Write a protein that binds this ligand. Structure first.
Ligand SMILES: *[C@@H]1O[C@H](CO)[C@@H](NC(C)=O)[C@H](O[C@H]2O[C@H](CO)[C@H](O)[C@H](O)[C@H]2O)[C@H]1NC(C)=O
Length: 158
């Protein structure tokens, strides 16, 4: 009816928002990084086979038998996915991505189980030897808060 009554509603409605978005902004990013992960996976098939058939991790996308160009394995929030010695790292785009996750990435690497291998998912890693990787510490890793509970693996997870 009156002006002020409206301002209260508007103030009320507007306060539930300011309060509620630092968590939607995260549900959001946590949704986006969740795909960088789905695009990262599916590259496991290629990579696993290459390793088991040859006993050497595929050096790049072409070796693993996937889109030779990493930029062809891109998405909406994913600007690409590159295989670097069995390690598959997904990168977050720069257009259409939260704010503190864009340009950031995660990695998926595996480990010789002997006759088979086990996969890990976590923050950017680099392969050292056929059975050892390490934190690709550089400052572009997707922050722990944005990663699922299933993608919290450390460089030395076994
Ligand atoms: C695919 O991954 C292989 C991993 O073993 C890698 N081999 C080695 C020994 O690193 C392949 O590279 C070889 O084959 C290419 C073919 O053009 C090229 O001749 C390289 O010199 C050779 O090492 C990887 N293939 C590619 C295309 O890089």
């Amino acid at each position: 009816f009156t002006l002020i009554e409206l301002m209260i509603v508007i103030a009320i409605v507007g306060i539930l928002a300011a309060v509620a978005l630092p968590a939607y902004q995260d549900y959001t990013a946590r949704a986006q990084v969740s795909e960088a992960i789905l695009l990262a996976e599916g590259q496991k098939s290629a990579v696993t086979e290459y390793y088991l058939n040859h006993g050497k991790w595929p050096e790049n996308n072409t070796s693993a038998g996937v889109a030779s160009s990493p930029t062809d394995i891109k998405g909406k929030y994913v600007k690409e996915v590159e295989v670097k010695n069995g390690v598959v790292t997904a990168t977050m785009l720069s257009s259409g991505v939260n704010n503190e996750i864009k340009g950031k990435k995660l990695s998926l690497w595996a480990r010789r189980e002997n006759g088979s291998v086990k996969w890990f998912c976590g923050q950017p890693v680099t392969r050292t030897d056929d059975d050892t990787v390490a934190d690709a510490k550089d400052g572009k890793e997707i922050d722990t808060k944005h990663l699922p509970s299933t993608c919290r693996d450390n460089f030395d997870a076994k």
